[PDB]
Structures are given as C-alpha cells and as structure tokens.
Amino acid sequence: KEKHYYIGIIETTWDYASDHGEKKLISVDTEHSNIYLQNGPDRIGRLYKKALYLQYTDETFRTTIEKPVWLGFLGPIIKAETGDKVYVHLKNLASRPYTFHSHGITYYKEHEGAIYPDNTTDFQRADDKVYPGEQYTYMLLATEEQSPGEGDGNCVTRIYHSHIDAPKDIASGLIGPLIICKKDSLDKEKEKHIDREFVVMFSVVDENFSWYLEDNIKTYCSEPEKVDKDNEDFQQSNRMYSVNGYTFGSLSGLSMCAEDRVKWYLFGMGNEVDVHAAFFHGQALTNKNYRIDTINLFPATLFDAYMVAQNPGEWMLSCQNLNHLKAGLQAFFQVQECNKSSSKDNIRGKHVRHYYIAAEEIIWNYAPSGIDIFTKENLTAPGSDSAVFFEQGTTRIGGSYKKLVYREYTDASFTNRKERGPEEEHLGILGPVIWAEVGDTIRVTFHNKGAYPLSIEPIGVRFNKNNEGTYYSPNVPPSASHVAPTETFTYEWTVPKEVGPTNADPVCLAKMYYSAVDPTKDIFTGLIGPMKICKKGSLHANGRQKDVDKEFYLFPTVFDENESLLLEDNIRMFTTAPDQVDKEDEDFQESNKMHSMNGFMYGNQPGLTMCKGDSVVWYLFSAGNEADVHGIYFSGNTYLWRGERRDTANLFPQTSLTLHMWPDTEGTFNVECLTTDHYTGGMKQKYTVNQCRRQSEDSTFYLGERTYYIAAVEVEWDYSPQREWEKELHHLQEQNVSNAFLDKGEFYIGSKYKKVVYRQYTDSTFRVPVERKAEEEHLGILGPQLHADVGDKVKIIFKNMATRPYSIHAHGVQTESSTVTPTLPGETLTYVWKIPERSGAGTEDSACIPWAYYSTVDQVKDLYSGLIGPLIVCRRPNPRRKLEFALLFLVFDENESWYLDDNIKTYSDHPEKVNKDDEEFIESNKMHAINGRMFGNLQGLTMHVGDEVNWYLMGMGNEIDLHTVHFHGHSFQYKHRGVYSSDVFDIFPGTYQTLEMFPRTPGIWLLHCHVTDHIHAGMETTYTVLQNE
C-alpha cells in the first residue's frame, strides 16, 4: 500500500476547557478551575493561539477531513503496516517555520524533518525547515525493523511532531499520532477484531513554551505591560494539565458499548513535571498480556493497552499524580448498555472474604529509635540532613505526626482488634493486607473513627457505581463515596477472572487501597493500605502463597505532611510557637516532607527478616506526585520480574509491582531508594537474611576467573570540550542563547570540573593505564566496560589514587558479605564479585545485561563526583558484526561533588561572589549529560549497516533524572529474542537495560532524552551509521 496523507499546519484558537458544563471532579473544588481557565488583566485564560496539524483531502489544501472530537488538538491519526510506503504531503499555512518528524518509521535524511548538525547538505535539509507557504512530501517506509514485535500487539503507539525546536514546536501544538501495525492487521484503517480505537496524550501542555506566548499575551491580557513572563503564578496559569488538550474534565466523545473490544493508544509528552499515572476507573486492562490498571507515562513514553469494556456507567480517566489530579487532569468516558451481548463472570456473591477495618488517629513516629540505624548518628544532630526533618522547636514539628490510619478488627462490633504478628511488623503505617482470589467477593465494613470524612477505594478489583470509593460526575446517610466521622459503610467488591492475574502474570499481583474522598490529602494523612489479588487456588486458607516462605509489602513515598488533613492539628500540637508558622515557607514545607518506606525512615523499619534460601515475594507500590520517582534497590540480591533479572525497582504514583527473590547470602543488606534526594532524606531500610541451614563446604563451580585493575583517579573533566555543535544547532534554530551551564559569565565555573573517575590499568603496579580504543571512546566519564560470564569469579584489584576514601561495588553481583570496605587514599584492596546464575539474564532477558558499578562510601556524593561504570554479564558457552555501547543518562549535579569547593576556587574568576545556596549558581552546576558529555560532545558511537548493536542504557540520579531515551532514524527491540520494540525507552535511577538495534539507514542521527528541560540543557548527541565496503 502506498498511502498518501495531506497535512497542513494552520494557526488557530484552541479552547482548553470547552465547557460546556457542568461538572464535579476528583479533588478540584469548583472555584479552582479558574487559576488556569479565567481571563483576567494578568491571565490569558482558556483560549490560546496554537499551531495545529489538520488533515486535508487534497494536494490543494482547501477542504479539511474532520477529525474525531476526542483527539482534541492532536494532529490527524496516520497509520501504516509493515511494508507500506507513506507519503505525508505537508503544507505550512502558518506564520513561522515547522517540520513533520515521525517516530518509529524508516526515512532517509531527506525525510527526517528534524534540524541538527548532521553534516547534511541542501538536498537532505529541505525537510528540516519548511517555511510559510512551502510544501514538502515526506516518504516514510514501514520497514520490518520498525514493526511491532512478536510480543507486541498488532499495532503500537508512535507519534509525529515538528522538530526545529521540538519542545517549543510541540508546546505550540504540533504533535500527533502514528499507529504502526503488523502486515494484515487492518481493514479500512481499523484493527480487525477491535471495536474502538482511542488515542490519548497525557501532558501538562506548557503554553509558556509556545511560539505564540507573546501574541497570546497581547490578545487576551488587558494589561500586557503588567505581565511578567517569569512570575511563577503567571507561568502556572499557562500550564494546561490535559488529555489531548482538554483540561478539567472537558475531553469530549469517549464513548463505548459494554463488551466492546477497546484498544487504547497512550503517550506522555512534556517535561520533568510530566510524571503521569493514567488510570481508567472501574475498568481492567492488559498490556503485553499482563493485567495492569495504572499506566505511567513520561515525556514521549509510548504505550498501548487493551480493554474489554465492562461494568457500565460514567467513569473517569485520571492522572493519579496527585498534583495533576488536583490541577484537574481528568476525562470522562462512557460505557453504555447496547445491550451487550456476552457477560462471562457470573460469581457475584458465592465465596466471601469479609474484612472489618476502621480509620483511627494515632501519633506516628517516623523514626522511633531516634537514631539513623545506618550511620548510628542520631537524627537531630545539628547540621545533619536528617535534622531538617526531625528537628523539633519553634516552627518545626519534628518526627512524630498525628495521622489517620486503617486498622483491622475481628468483627462488626469494632470492640477488639486483630493484633499484628511478626509477619505484619514491617507494614507500619500501612493498613491491613486485603487479599482475595479470582472468584471471591470482598465485603469491607469500614468504620470511621476520625474527625474527617473518609472512604476506601481499591485498585485491582471490580466494583459497581454505588460501591465506588470516590465521587465525580459530569452533572446522612453513609455511602461508598462519603463515610462521615462516626458512620459505617460496607463495601462490596468482586474479583472476576477479567480483573485478576492473567496467564502471563505471576500467581499474585501487588495492589493497594486508599481513601478517595480527597485522595490528594487522604493518602498523605495515612489512609493507604496493601492488597494482594491472586489466581484461583493459589493461596492457603491463611492468605499466604503456596511455596512462599515470606511475603513483604513495601510502600515508599514522600509522605507530604503539608497535605495532611491533620496539618493544623500537628502545628498546634508540636511547635513551640504555632502562631509564628508560615505554611507557605519552603523550609517549613521541606521539614514536613517525610521520605519514608511504610512510614519508616533512616533504617528504622523493622520486621524484614528471612532465611537464606527462602522464597520471598516483594509486593511494592507507591503514590504521590512528580517527586515520587523511586528506584528501590535491594543491595546484595537480585530478583525476577516478568522473567527479567534486576535489583532496583522503579515506582511512580500508583505503580504496583510484584518481585520474586531467593536470598542467597547471609547478612544484613539494604532496601533503599537510590533517588539521591530520597536516600539522603531517609528512604532507606535494612533486611536481614539469616543462615538457617548447615553451611556446607561449597563454591565448587567457577567456570571462569577474571582480574581487573581499576583505580579511582582525580581528573579535570570537561562536559563540553568543544562548543561547535551547540553553536551550529542554535544557529540552525535561530536561537540565542545564554547557556546557563557552560557560560562562565561574571563568576561561574563553566564546563570544566575536577572529578574522580574509574580507570583501567594493565597490572598491579598501576603505572600504566589501559589505552582506550576507538570502540570505547564513547564511554566518556564512565569507567571501563567490565565483562563477566555467568559462572565467573571476578577479582577487582582497586587502587584509590584519589584524596579521600572510595570503593568499587556492582549491582546484580554476589559477594561474601553485606559490608563493602572503603579503600583509603594510596591503598589497594581486592574485591571479589561472584557471578552466579542470578547475576545474569532471566528467562526473558537478552544474553547480556548491564549493571552499574559504583562507590558505596557515600553513594550520593561519590556518584556525582564521577565514580560510575558498566559491568556487562553474559550467558552461554558466519553471522553479523556485533557492537556494544553503554550510555549513562545522568544530570551530574556538580553541587554535590566532593570537589565543589576546589572547583569554585579553581575556575571562578571571583570565588568570593559565589553563594553556594543561590538558585542560579545551583542550576549552573547541573550538567545534563550522556556519559558526562553534552551538546554532541559524546563521540565514537559509530556502526555499519548490517551490524547488531547492543545499547546498554543506564540511569542514575535524583527525582528529576527521568530520562526518556530516543533514537532518531532507527528503533530498537528488547527482551529475549527482540519481542518488544520501540524507539523511546524510559530510564530512571536504577534502570539498566539492553536494547538491540539493527541499523539500516546511513546517516548521522540524533540521540537524545525527550524531556524538554533536558534537551535544552544539552542531554543529546549523535550516532553514525555508515554504509558498507
């Protein structure tokens, strides 16, 4: 099929909230919509000039093909099937230059529609700047390499947008869907055996970034002269939390029949605030044949889900990022009776699990011992990081808060409790486990003994409209939505086969419950609890899983006590001077942000104990906002998840995960969040693995032995040795051109910083560094790429050539002991890393998987000072050339380096003028690099057509280190045998991933994180595909 589309870019008004009316939303209180939507002398309002893609019939762009009402401002849906040749005839009827750049489809440099320094000449540059009145025809081929995977649906979510300044072009409104499908998937532009196809973009559409910001300020503001574009409140008012451009519940036309087979194409778009949690209330979806209910989306995350629509009524599609929810990121959809036909389960009443739970106020100490169990230091030590959170005095609450927690009782009398045992000691602030099997019916008698109205809203089970735990709509006594301060309601949930684990899932799936009267306050108050939905006949009568020694529930979150219903109470109860407290003081707000695991902090979480050999299942879930970017690292052990070997689990708002671990080493290890602020703020705990069998004289399998000589060495590191690529890009872009990170100006540091980094040496004398070859030029700041095979004992001979104590240690790897010995300056130590089966690929991994190696002495500062490398572990005992590249996506926060003072003194032209606490100086030191290089300074990513390339992506860092790695020109495949495919991979702290690529098309191709703030900050480079012979 040759397909021909005619897309034109017109400027036009967009209404973000096309009333009409009139609504009640979750957690938005009537008189709040108008922060974003109300026209004032100072405020644009709900109407904006935007550049939009429209579809036309004709090379004579005159009569438009109307687009679905639910698309909103997204451009027209383009589709293609493996084999197809799509011709996108673009015509610019707007006032400035734009392009059409497509994801997930093959093009030559003439048809990429993206401008950047690629050493192309004019023939291959017409695509990259289509001027007003110009017209360009993009030839896109749907190659085999870009097609959906074996393990994928028939169709996957892709996107197109303009790419001169992509972030700005997209904010201005030039973004749209491409659905790519397998060969004979489609009949008349619709998937065979699918009834409805919707496309949904979650984005905080930031009109501050639009090309038309100024035009819009003139048009809509009565006092333009009075508008400060840098006023924070002005900026917020132009942030349109929307799905498809529709804000506050106004998305129109999402309608379907019960039993319709619905395929949803979702994607996220935007910036660091775009931590999305897409959640279809009342319904049940699969993704890659797995049961899911929340779909997390980030800038350019591409995601597809299947839904058999059921449980008829009016439901919400919401973002469960609590900030997004309360900023109104909500859309209604309709499941109607028509009349069906089928039904299938049935079971609503037969086998009944009955729970008696009460909300009641306790005084929760986040750290009972008063000590940091990790350091033995105590938490109020003046000047300590913990002090910020545990200091108690004039205007500071400290470490104990009144909270409203769920607690279990034996029966409807609520006269006596179901006490907690050993198995339940780790739950802390969590409520009681609710568990159920496919076929059960859950009835929950909820009795509120708190001063505020609460509810229970479960994720993971089916319930009907008058059992729903939250209230929303498009139009005395107690109900599912409202259970007031002394009342009592009894919920009824069902768990049919349609809502439980699937064949691919494990036996049980981590889920959760919370109070959703106002979930943006209720959860943080304490009303969160763990839940466990399992397959038929999988649990024993007592709830425990068959052949499972231990079951743990971890809930990591920044418990934001500023948002608790009980804030005022806690101020009045714990501060010396309640009247002197400003709830809006940032330092006051920080003091209330309790970074915790199950409400415990700084290693105070008890009850995480097990035997070596035990079968352990970890149920993890989280809630919160954009700050809740978690990487939960089990030091000393790995786990399987969907057949993947990993040791760090990423959680976002309303994420749930089920990990299986079999601990193989006696000791006391760490479960900790690697997200550097969370770690520092006390999101860290211990778990003990005890020796419960006779030791046995063992270690009788070493298929291999390796020694590496590595040194920590202090060096001048330049993030941007040259600035030509940058200067060229901004010229092409017509931009200008303060660089906050590289421009020294009056007194800033610039691009060069003293750092400490890992380097390989030839032998134990450490006199002679291993020469970095052409194929390892790309490593950049990274230490050497260490290789190991499953079965190896790897000796690391480590010399600390730097001026303070450091260590070397690896993820995934097994060692003799839970402790890692620091090695002092001048000293050489030996570390032994064993590589058992569980340090290598799972059933469903690629043959080679990466692990980060790093320094344990101070994990935050040692990392930002520059100590970080890749260990690659491989399975097993004519074809193509096989290449390897390792990529760290990390904002090197040079403010946290040990060498900061050294650097201020060495590079600043006026050291005295530097204030370390000044925001502007802090930004100047946040180096948004790939492998320690910015703006195209990462060299040596070269390959030939026909090669197989393993890309080892590695992410570390802080809350803002969510990186959405995108490759121009080619997509990749992932997982055993290449069964999922994409061209954007999401990387967070702790995420290490192999992606296989089979490059076809010659060129120099852009490779960049797709987060607005990171692209502009320079987190990008190019890679080169060369033709043959």
Ligand SMILES: *C1O[C@H](CO)[C@@H](O)[C@H](O)[C@H]1NC(C)=O
């Ligand atoms: C630790 O020392 C602090 C220092 O001010 C002291 O006041 C406190 O009692 C100690 N903490 C505990 C509970 O051990």
Ligand SMILES: *[C@@H]1O[C@H](CO)[C@@H](O)[C@H](O)[C@H]1NC(C)=O
């Ligand atoms: C672009 O061309 C310059 C000058 O000929 C050359 O030195 C450089 O290798 C090229 N850049 C890339 C990314 O290949």
Ligand SMILES: [Ca+2]
């Ligand atoms: Ca081009």
Ligand SMILES: [Cu+2]
């Ligand atoms: Cu893109």
Ligand SMILES: [Cu+2]
């Ligand atoms: Cu969101």
Ligand SMILES: [Cu+2]
């Ligand atoms: Cu975290």
Ligand SMILES: [Cu+2]
């Ligand atoms: Cu990024």
Ligand SMILES: [Cu+2]
């Ligand atoms: Cu792209």
Ligand SMILES: [Cu+2]
């Ligand atoms: Cu791009």
Ligand SMILES: [Cu+2]
């Ligand atoms: Cu940034």
Ligand code: NA
């Ligand atoms: Na606005």
Ligand code: NA
């Ligand atoms: Na506090």
Ligand code: NA
């Ligand atoms: Na800098």
Ligand SMILES: [O]
């Ligand atoms: O792309």
